[PDB]
Design an enzyme around this catalytic site. Sequence first.
Site, short mmCIF file in Angstrom:
data_model
loop_
_atom_site.label_atom_id
_atom_site.label_comp_id
_atom_site.label_asym_id
_atom_site.label_seq_id
_atom_site.Cartn_x
_atom_site.Cartn_y
_atom_site.Cartn_z
N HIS A 1 0.85 -1.23 0.00
CA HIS A 1 0.00 0.00 0.00
C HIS A 1 0.88 1.27 0.00
O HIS A 1 0.73 2.15 0.80
CB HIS A 1 -1.04 -0.05 1.13
CG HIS A 1 -2.18 -0.97 0.87
ND1 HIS A 1 -2.30 -2.19 1.51
CD2 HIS A 1 -3.25 -0.86 0.06
CE1 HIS A 1 -3.38 -2.81 1.07
NE2 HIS A 1 -3.98 -2.01 0.17
N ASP B 1 -8.07 -0.50 -8.44
CA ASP B 1 -7.44 -0.94 -7.16
C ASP B 1 -6.91 -2.36 -7.25
O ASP B 1 -5.84 -2.72 -6.59
CB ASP B 1 -8.46 -0.78 -6.05
CG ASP B 1 -7.81 -0.66 -4.69
OD1 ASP B 1 -6.59 -0.33 -4.64
OD2 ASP B 1 -8.53 -0.81 -3.71
N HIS C 1 1.83 1.66 -5.63
CA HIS C 1 0.45 1.16 -5.79
C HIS C 1 -0.42 2.31 -6.27
O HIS C 1 -1.22 2.13 -7.21
CB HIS C 1 -0.02 0.56 -4.47
CG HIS C 1 -1.47 0.29 -4.48
ND1 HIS C 1 -2.04 -0.71 -5.27
CD2 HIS C 1 -2.47 0.85 -3.77
CE1 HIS C 1 -3.33 -0.79 -4.98
NE2 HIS C 1 -3.64 0.19 -4.08
N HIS D 1 -5.85 7.53 -3.24
CA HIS D 1 -6.88 6.63 -2.69
C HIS D 1 -6.37 5.86 -1.48
O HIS D 1 -7.26 5.39 -0.69
CB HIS D 1 -7.50 5.69 -3.77
CG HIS D 1 -6.73 4.45 -3.98
ND1 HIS D 1 -5.56 4.44 -4.72
CD2 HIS D 1 -6.91 3.20 -3.53
CE1 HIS D 1 -5.11 3.21 -4.77
NE2 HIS D 1 -5.90 2.43 -4.02
N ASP D 2 -5.07 5.69 -1.28
CA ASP D 2 -4.55 4.96 -0.09
C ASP D 2 -3.60 5.85 0.76
O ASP D 2 -2.70 5.36 1.45
CB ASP D 2 -3.87 3.65 -0.49
CG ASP D 2 -4.82 2.45 -0.67
OD1 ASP D 2 -5.91 2.40 -0.06
OD2 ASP D 2 -4.46 1.54 -1.39
N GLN E 1 -5.93 -17.62 -3.51
CA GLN E 1 -5.99 -16.70 -4.67
C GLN E 1 -7.12 -17.13 -5.63
O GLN E 1 -7.90 -16.25 -6.15
CB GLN E 1 -4.62 -16.69 -5.35
CG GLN E 1 -3.56 -15.86 -4.63
CD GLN E 1 -3.93 -14.41 -4.57
OE1 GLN E 1 -3.91 -13.71 -5.57
NE2 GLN E 1 -4.28 -13.92 -3.38
C1 LIG Z 1 -4.76 -7.45 -5.81
C2 LIG Z 1 -5.71 -8.26 -4.99
N1 LIG Z 1 -5.10 -9.48 -4.47
C3 LIG Z 1 -4.31 -10.19 -5.44
C4 LIG Z 1 -5.39 -9.86 -3.21
O1 LIG Z 1 -5.09 -10.99 -2.66
C5 LIG Z 1 -6.15 -8.87 -2.42
C6 LIG Z 1 -6.00 -7.42 -2.38
N2 LIG Z 1 -6.77 -6.90 -1.38
N3 LIG Z 1 -7.40 -7.87 -0.81
C7 LIG Z 1 -8.27 -7.75 0.36
C8 LIG Z 1 -7.09 -9.12 -1.40
C9 LIG Z 1 -7.70 -10.41 -0.96
O2 LIG Z 1 -8.76 -10.41 -0.32
N4 LIG Z 1 -7.02 -11.57 -1.31
C10 LIG Z 1 -7.36 -12.82 -0.69
C11 LIG Z 1 -8.73 -13.20 -0.27
C12 LIG Z 1 -8.93 -14.39 0.33
N5 LIG Z 1 -7.83 -15.18 0.60
C13 LIG Z 1 -7.63 -16.40 1.28
C14 LIG Z 1 -6.25 -16.67 1.16
C15 LIG Z 1 -5.51 -17.76 1.74
C16 LIG Z 1 -4.13 -17.64 1.81
C17 LIG Z 1 -3.37 -18.67 2.36
C18 LIG Z 1 -4.03 -19.81 2.85
C19 LIG Z 1 -5.39 -19.92 2.72
O3 LIG Z 1 -6.13 -21.02 3.19
C20 LIG Z 1 -7.59 -20.95 3.13
C21 LIG Z 1 -7.99 -22.36 3.71
F1 LIG Z 1 -7.70 -22.49 5.09
C22 LIG Z 1 -6.16 -18.90 2.18
N6 LIG Z 1 -5.56 -15.68 0.42
C23 LIG Z 1 -6.55 -14.79 0.10
N7 LIG Z 1 -6.37 -13.63 -0.55
MG LIG Z 2 -7.39 1.15 0.14
ZN LIG Z 3 -5.53 0.58 -3.02
#
Ligand SMILES: CCN(C)C(=O)c1cnn(C)c1C(=O)Nc1ccn2cc(-c3cccc(OCCF)c3)nc2n1
Ligand SMILES: [Mg+2]
Ligand SMILES: [Zn+2]
EC number: 3.1.4.17
Length: 313
Positions: free
Chosen positions: A68, A217, A72, A106-107, A269
């Site tokens: 952030h 974003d 970004h 925005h951030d 992911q």
């Molecule tokens: C640019 C956006 N981006 C690429 C992003 O990741 C991004 C940017 N902003 N935000 C909020 C996100 C986002 O919410 N990402 C997530 C959402 C849910 N996840 C669960 C997991 C996860 C990871 C490791 C183990 C695991 O085990 C689940 C079973 F136990 C689950 N990793 C996630 N990543």
């Molecule tokens: Mg933000």
């Molecule tokens: Zn952002």
Amino acid sequence: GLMQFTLPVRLCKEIELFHFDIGPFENMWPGIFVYMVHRSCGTSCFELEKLCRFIMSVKKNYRRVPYHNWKHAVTVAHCMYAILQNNHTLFTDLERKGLLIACLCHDLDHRGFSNSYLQKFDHPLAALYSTSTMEQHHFSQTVSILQLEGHNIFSTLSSSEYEQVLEIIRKAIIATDLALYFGNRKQLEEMYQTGSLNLNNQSHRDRVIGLMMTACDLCSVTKLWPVTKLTANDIYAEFWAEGDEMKKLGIQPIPMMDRDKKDEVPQGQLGFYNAVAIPCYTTLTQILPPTEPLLKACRDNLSQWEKVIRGEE
Ligand SMILES: CCN(C)C(=O)c1cnn(C)c1C(=O)Nc1ccn2cc(-c3cccc(OCCF)c3)nc2n1
Ligand SMILES: [Mg+2]
Ligand SMILES: [Zn+2]
């Protein structure tokens, strides 16, 4: 007046493409931004001196966090630039001005922590702003910087044009709270599908800009795979630091923020692509057909994470 910014040949060409990476040379990023303002908006949109001073004050108010950060900010702004350049006639003079600035700001002053962590920590920002905590903060820092002597890039606007542009910026920055994206996208989905979507309806344009802000974003998921994969490392460095800070409050973090569950990142992911990213870019492409390359890059990246799970990489 006649002082244009120009970029090396490769950047001049590739900056026009959604999947452009702004590169590792930080001192070129202000210039890349001004270049985009000038082509998007015009060489008269801002006084060059006030704009350069605004940009440098914005940069100073981003912190040295893994994801952030100032990079970004400039990246999100570039995805807005590509959306606006591919939809020339759809947006007003004030909207092109406002949105590039909104994306850059925005951030502002992000600490690398979620709204959830601020509330669990009982941070002073959580008492001031009970929802979209960091986003109301980002908007506050934007107005503060705009009120610094010599930094009011909007000064040549009338009073109503100025209240209009700050209101576009406020709505665009609030819209970057992902908690608000789910319902914004669902409403746009219904409106496009019942044919009631009306770009002359202000409440409707607002929702479309909100979706644009989510799309910009999240644009890490729209880059070439080597870019998307290396940015995921910075995304998770912040999440895992928040997880560690949750464990210090005696709270088990969600798997996304638990570094002990690094193995499950590829499956996490996939969920995110399927629940957030793909739906976001699908609806954007329905409303704005020339944004289709974002949806096509996102699908390519989904298929690359499916290859990581199959241990083909
Ligand atoms: C640019 C956006 N981006 C690429 C992003 O990741 C991004 C940017 N902003 N935000 C909020 C996100 C986002 O919410 N990402 C997530 C959402 C849910 N996840 C669960 C997991 C996860 C990871 C490791 C183990 C695991 O085990 C689940 C079973 F136990 C689950 N990793 C996630 N990543
Ligand atoms: Mg933000
Ligand atoms: Zn952002």
